[PDB]
Amino acid sequence: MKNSVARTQPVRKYENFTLENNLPLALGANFHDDPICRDTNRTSHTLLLPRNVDYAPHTEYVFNGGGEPVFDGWMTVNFD
Amino acid sequence: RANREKQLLDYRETYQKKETQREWDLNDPHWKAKDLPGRVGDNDPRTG
Amino acid sequence: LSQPVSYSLLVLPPKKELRKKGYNMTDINTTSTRVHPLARWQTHVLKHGATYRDALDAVEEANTKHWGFLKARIQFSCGSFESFVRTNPNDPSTLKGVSTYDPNGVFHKETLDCTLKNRSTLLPRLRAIVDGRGHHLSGSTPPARSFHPQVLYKNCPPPVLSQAGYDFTPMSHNAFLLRTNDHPQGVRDVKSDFMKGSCDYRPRAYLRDEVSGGVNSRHCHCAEVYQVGDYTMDLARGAEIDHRNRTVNFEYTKKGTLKSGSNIVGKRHARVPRF
Amino acid sequence: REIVCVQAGQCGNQIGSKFWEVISDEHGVDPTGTYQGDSDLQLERINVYFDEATGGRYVPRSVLIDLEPGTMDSVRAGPYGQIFRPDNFIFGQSGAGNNWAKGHYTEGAELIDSVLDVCCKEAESCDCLQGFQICHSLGGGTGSGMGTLLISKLREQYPDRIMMTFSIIPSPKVSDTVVEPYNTTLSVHQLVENSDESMCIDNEALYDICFRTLKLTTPTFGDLNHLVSAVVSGVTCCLRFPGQLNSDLRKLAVNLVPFPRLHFFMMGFAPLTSRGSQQYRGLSVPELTQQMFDAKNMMQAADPRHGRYLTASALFRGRMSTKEVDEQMLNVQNKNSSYFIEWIPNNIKSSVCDIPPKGLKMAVTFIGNNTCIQEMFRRVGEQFTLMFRRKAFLHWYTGEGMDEMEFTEAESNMNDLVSEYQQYQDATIE
Amino acid sequence: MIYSDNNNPREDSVFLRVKRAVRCGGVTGPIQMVDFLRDFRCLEEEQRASGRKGVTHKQFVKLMEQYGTKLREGDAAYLCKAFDDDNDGYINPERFVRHFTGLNQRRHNAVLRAWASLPKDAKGRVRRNHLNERFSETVTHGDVWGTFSPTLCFEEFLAFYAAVSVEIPLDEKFELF
Amino acid sequence: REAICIHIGQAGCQVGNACWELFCLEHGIQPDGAMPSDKTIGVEDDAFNTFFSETGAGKHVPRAVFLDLEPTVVDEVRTGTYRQLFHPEQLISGKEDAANNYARGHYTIGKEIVDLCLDRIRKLADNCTGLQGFLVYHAVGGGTGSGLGALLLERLSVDYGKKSKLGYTVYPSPQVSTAVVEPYNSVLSTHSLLEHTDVAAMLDNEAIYDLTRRNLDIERPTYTNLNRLIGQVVSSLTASLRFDGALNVDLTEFQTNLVPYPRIHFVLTSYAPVISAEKAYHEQLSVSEISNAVFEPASMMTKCDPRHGKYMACCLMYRGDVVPKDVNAAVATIKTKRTIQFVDWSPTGFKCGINYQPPTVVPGGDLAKVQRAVCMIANSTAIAEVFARIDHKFDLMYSKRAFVHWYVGEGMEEGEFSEAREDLAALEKDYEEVGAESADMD
Amino acid sequence: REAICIHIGQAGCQVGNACWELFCLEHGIQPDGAMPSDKTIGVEDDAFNTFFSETGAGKHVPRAVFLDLEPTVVDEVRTGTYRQLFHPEQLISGKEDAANNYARGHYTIGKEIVDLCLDRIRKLADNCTGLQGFLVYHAVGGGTGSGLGALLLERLSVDYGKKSKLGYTVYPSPQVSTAVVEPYNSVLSTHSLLEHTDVAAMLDNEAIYDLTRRNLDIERPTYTNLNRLIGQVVSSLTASLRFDGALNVDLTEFQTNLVPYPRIHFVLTSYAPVISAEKAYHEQLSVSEISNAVFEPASMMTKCDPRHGKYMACCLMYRGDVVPKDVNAAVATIKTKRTIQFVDWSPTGFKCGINYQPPTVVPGGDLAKVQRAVCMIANSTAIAEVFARIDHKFDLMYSKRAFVHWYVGEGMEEGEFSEAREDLAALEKDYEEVGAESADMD
Amino acid sequence: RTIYDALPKLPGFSFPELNPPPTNGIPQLCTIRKGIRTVFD
Ligand SMILES: Nc1nc2c(ncn2[C@@H]2O[C@H](COP(=O)(O)OP(=O)(O)OP(=O)(O)O)[C@@H](O)[C@H]2O)c(=O)[nH]1
Ligand SMILES: Nc1nc2c(ncn2[C@@H]2O[C@H](COP(=O)(O)OP(=O)(O)OP(=O)(O)O)[C@@H](O)[C@H]2O)c(=O)[nH]1
Ligand SMILES: Nc1nc2c(ncn2[C@@H]2O[C@H](COP(=O)(O)OP(=O)(O)O)[C@@H](O)[C@H]2O)c(=O)[nH]1
Ligand SMILES: [Mg+2]
Ligand SMILES: [Mg+2]
Ligand SMILES: [Zn+2]
What we know:
Bound molecules: guanosine-5'-triphosphate, guanosine-5'-diphosphate, magnesium ion, zinc ion
Number of helices of chain D: 14
Largest interface: C-F, 44 and 49 residues
Protein name (chain E): EF-hand domain-containing protein
Largest sheet of chain C: 4 strands, antiparallel
Shape of chain C: elongated
Strand content of chain C: 5-15%
Subcellular location (chain H): Cytoplasm, Cytoskeleton, Flagellum axoneme
Structural class of chain C: alpha+beta
Keywords (chain E): Calcium, Metal-binding, Repeat
Largest sheet of chain D: 10 strands, mixed
Structural class of chain D: alpha/beta
Number of strands of chain D: 12
GO molecular function (chain E): calcium ion binding
Radius of gyration of chain D: 21 Å
Protein name (chain H): Rib72 protein-like protein
Oligomer: part of a larger assembly
Distance between the termini of chain D: 45 Å
């Protein structure tokens, strides 16, 4: 698209969903396709728009697993 | 990027005003309203 | 054409060392192509002025230099070589080479006829037809000058000029007329981004005389038929195209140059009106 | 077993900067030259691309050549620029002007002795020398002329080593330079005689990689040069790390080139995938093989479906079984049997290396020898014939001094190369 | 440069020269910028008290000359027309304040995050004595304590840290700093 | 790295004033010749070097000469705002004008001044280490611009060698006119200029007036506007030497790509985002839109229509925030159009350049501020109509010997008229023949 | 996805004001196109893109051109409330009108103005990626609307080719009339429109006056009411592109379904819940009631009675809270009616569309608020009666050459009158032939 | 050290504008002089 680059895929509600309400997907009970159960009818080109993400990154990635005695004569003996 | 272009628009709106241009005295509308005729009265200093 | 660049030598160790290792002095002659286990390869560099003659002299010098020597190889700059062997083993003064190998022998032999066919085709085309000053030769003059109305606008609409929007001498405008959807042979379907393909915007003159009744008004002269100089141009009567806006026919000259299409249909014999 | 790199012209110097960034990252070399890596396995083969300097420092076995220092001054000013040895920068005082004859004959012969002196100083310092590696564009001026000059001189001086080139070639759709057909034809004529193995890349194919596979919104030349740096550093990976089935540049050449003129290859690199898609597919050897043969992932405009593979090679990086590699290469050869030349019983060589690039579980680089490359040369020869009949722009080249017979010889030799590919494509046992 | 690149598109050359003059004049530069903002606010307050709707052009250029701006031919009128919105001989305060303490998006967000970190009381305003001992060993630029009038508001904070922005040419380094 | 600018006559000096105003403001050199107070040896700051050299005290001075025969314009420079910027030796002035006579400039008056000019240029060229061409500004309509410009280019061409000479030239407009004798001076100038220039870029004041009326919202434009547009185009073309970019372009590359045959060196120039601040907020200004803009004849700075000819080569310069894929997509879209035609012997029609520095904004200016721009110079057979229209006016005047006694009196043989007119006839025939399709030539 | 609107002359610009008012308020773009000072984007979603494009700063600008020969109406647009919405280049105005002469618009003046219009439309079409047609609003009764609309459609048809062109056309009412010369202009327009339009929808002001008297409660209607109704119709037809629905309908599907033979492309239009606020709360408004409503002649926006002809195809667009089973039951009941007849060669007479977005309410409007609406465009042989009456009035005037000297003076041959009259006679015979039963011809 | 550079060098993981250059000029770090090349920093 050639519009503003700050746009993101919108959020849809689709209320009255049987699978989310501890109910079987019975015949003649597809309420989430009823237009009264939506919040908007505006079509948005989701196949071109990106998605929204919010998180605090990891700041670091690991790739390894984390893991005078000179002689000047004077020989002395110690049994340690 | 979006805020970049918004700030560019701010710059355009505030520093590039139309009356700022050097050639405003020629391109100004109402330029004949602000000027004077050749001679005004009979004691006009401009009429040498 | 080619010149020698190096000569290769295969030798045996000295006689005393060969006896010390335990290998028999005799029984070196055999009909097999294999070599003795103690034979070592060494190479030497020839100078710039070297030719075949002095290289062969150096090979003969190596032959007479020391015992334990029956193999030779002279390498040219083209990658080819020939070998020299003794006809009678352990006997000098019988050296004679019967061999010639190059890496491109069978390769060139097998690809011969196609190479000559393509060479006979292409080389006549490479001949210059223009003087170094950018001027045509005395033969095969063009039938008309370039800036003539029908030559310059043979397959392109002429511009339209108008005074609107200008204070001085007017200038024309660009158009959106696309070209034929033709692609090079054997190229992947490339899109750097979303392009406007020419499969759509197919002209409405395609099959107009068959599925429709053809032109039924004089308004074709407003945007489709042009009077260029002494002739007539029609945008509906050009090169034939298919249903997907692709050229159908390709034509060539005697020497094999692609010939562009023409929209010029007819000549208008204009005369000033007199009594 | 150490390689010496040469970077020539603007394209070559820019790709080289990204290559040496990737290599310095894989071996943990700080841009100051200090080793900061995290396993001994990195150090024990560092010699392959780096020479050892005395104190805490490493120096890269590379020669930089250009006719005007502008690119060199930009790369030297870059974040990794300090690593390069100052004495290794060779430059003139006026540009090539994108003209082959100028780049080859006037400033070329002026600089070439100092370039050869630097290359010899670097080569004779090695304890055992492997092949040279050269990056340049064929459409340019100093890249084409001085690159092919230097290649010819090194082939005279080092005929027993390997000569390998990475080369940028004109797109079929849009030109970057008006005079590309002359420079390309003369350079291909020089290369087919001099080179042992040459890889060709279209910028248009990299654009299609970026747009279709990675779906990047705003790609930059850094991304294209990163893709190239990835494949170049991948082909040599088995040279410099342990593995279950070692491979080498000479062994690759021996398995890939059936006849000495047929040495032009296509390249690809597999684990390319958009930031949105990675959640949808785990890495496995079938997935890598499928991407490996998809023409979407190939860096040339010619498509395999119009030709046949004589030979191909796949180098795998990662911890994996040999059974899946062998059986995948068998299954691909069996299922697509019409696209493989039938008088060779097995066209694919495989190789396996234990250590993948950081942050990927597995990777493969693909090298392919396919007859469909003949159509690209045919297109360039056509455009050359179109220009030559009209003597297009010819006075520049003739004014430098070239004989026209050079142009007719180079055109004839390239035309014979296309004919030779066409004959072997349609050959039969009979 | 700073007024030509895409990273900072709001900058203008002559206003950059004015800011350079008011910063490098003469008590360090950021202190001078905070003082300039304070004088502008008190002047506009006095004018509002008198019964006139804002600072005029003449006292604006007088203030600029007082802080030591070596102006040229026609630049004073350029700035006077630039910040006059209604075109009636008056200078808009909000536009001038927004331009005076201007910053890039990343730098502005860094300043906002830092300001949100500190605690406030009463009407959103900080005090020096409550927090001078807590952050004594970590504030390298000790001029902040001199900026306190032991009180400080967000506009002075933003002006102070916009003054120091010229010393750090990298945005990431500014954020971490 | 270095380039030397030569400014000749009235138009060339006034355009030079606008250019050096622009180059100062873009690099940051103050009018008194001083780097701003925040720049030191702390960071590497050398981009000016293409156009300025610094003295041992750190003052900057520019690599230019200003040439005039009348004092008034150079005395205006001497008394103007930039008095301290220029070295006084650089501003050279004679006593009296060439009175619209090419012959007076070339034979009588320019021969006296020319040796000082060559000595000054030599003194500049000795203080260089990578000079890579001359930029020349002159008008061919006036006497001193034609005569001294030709004489000076001839002398430079003898003294220097293998060095590029790029001209920006103001030609006589096809119906706007300033003097009666314009055809004679333009013919004789173009005759001398033909042998001794590598690429010539053509400008017409009537076209730039139309452009300032059409694109900008100026009812009563004057030469300062025109000169600011010219300064922007030259800054765009020379930006490739001075700032970082993806694809740089040296001045020698223009001649290699644009000139197919040694006489065929006249090119068209256009500039895309000529736009006012009020229009700028109604429109996005993407790469493809400005690329589409440079091909409209309404964008051109010379009054010729390229639809009456065929293109041989185009050179497209992009500066600012552009990505190579968009440049490739734009050029590929242009190539599809049917009303844009290239000669069949030129298949690879395009040269590209990509630079990161966006165009600078001048305080009094009328152009908007924009993040990206594209500039085009192109070679096309349509130029034959410009010469043909000048030649018809020459034939009309010479048929009656309308003014010849002036030219013969100031020192020129009458024969020179016939020689020049025959050379322009041959140039017309070159442009007729070159446009002939190869398939018809067999 | 995107569509470009072309508004011509007085009716087309005035209807454009109502259309863009509605499309702004329905999508949510402010009348000036700006956004609140704290938001980063004015709206969350791209759905506007069919009719508006946003700049990178988020201002909205609409995909339209306004074409007129007199300045006054466009100057009213320039000074009105929507000043900031339109780009100033889009608002094109000439100096003087076409003076009710088709010849003056087509030959003399529109021929001068047309190239600017084509350049603006091209500039729009270059900023698109899935253009799927042109929408044109004009009246055929006046001089510039007829002449320049025809000339522009001819040029568009050559340049863009296969792309669809859908016209909304105001034809001369059968007894209300405004000018004497209406028949000549309407005949010559229809002659040009036959070759160069894919579907043409015809409107008559007398029908919309009748509709506003009976259904709405307006004693003194004016053109703004009619234009708001037209805007609602256009919004209903284009809603299928812009909002979610069960059965979408792309603009290319209309031409495929409605036109049996290439000349038979003139369609009738009607709209169901045209109702006042006081009536709306006295009645339920179910699907079957509005489906029954659309076939009554009291609902039509063109003054023709379809009971005097035969339908060839119908396209029914439902928007709002409708369920498919009720649409199917309604259409089967309509099919049952005896005063509705289809030609025996067209058994599958219907195309359906179903969209979920209910019609928008405009602050100053006169329509009630309703949950659902249906709009129909249909092809019927009854249309032949309108042409027969225009042709008879033309024949009456032309028998004495009553006004022809104006047309001949403005550039037209007298022969063009007779040619157009035989073509319209042949169109009448086509409508006679297409309507002949196949069972009767055996 | 920071979340802006804590990613491996793989294609598609580079964000060029996050590290914008403070300047766009060309230094003269590579000169010829009288024929003695200098690569001074
Ligand atoms: N674009 C532009 N054109 C100019 C300018 N000054 C003069 N011209 C044009 O150039 C032509 C006049 O040439 P001049 O430069 O005055 O001639 P000259 O070089 O002074 O020659 P002499 O009169 O002999 O001194 C006319 O066509 C003018 O319109 C200018 O500043 N800008
Ligand atoms: N429905 C409707 N009809 C209109 C409107 N304006 C004018 N008309 C009708 O259209 C016809 C007049 O056409 P105009 O648009 O005035 O003609 P024009 O395009 O201005 O042509 P010129 O007079 O030559 O300038 C008459 O039948 C009017 O009743 C309008 O706003 N709405
Ligand atoms: N992939 C890639 N191509 C490049 C790069 N730089 C230049 N090119 C291409 O190489 C060609 C220009 O050759 P160039 O390097 O300028 O030749 P030179 O003047 O001899 O150095 C054009 O096709 C450019 O698109 C780069 O960094 N990456
Ligand atoms: Mg003068
Ligand atoms: Mg009117
Ligand atoms: Zn017509």
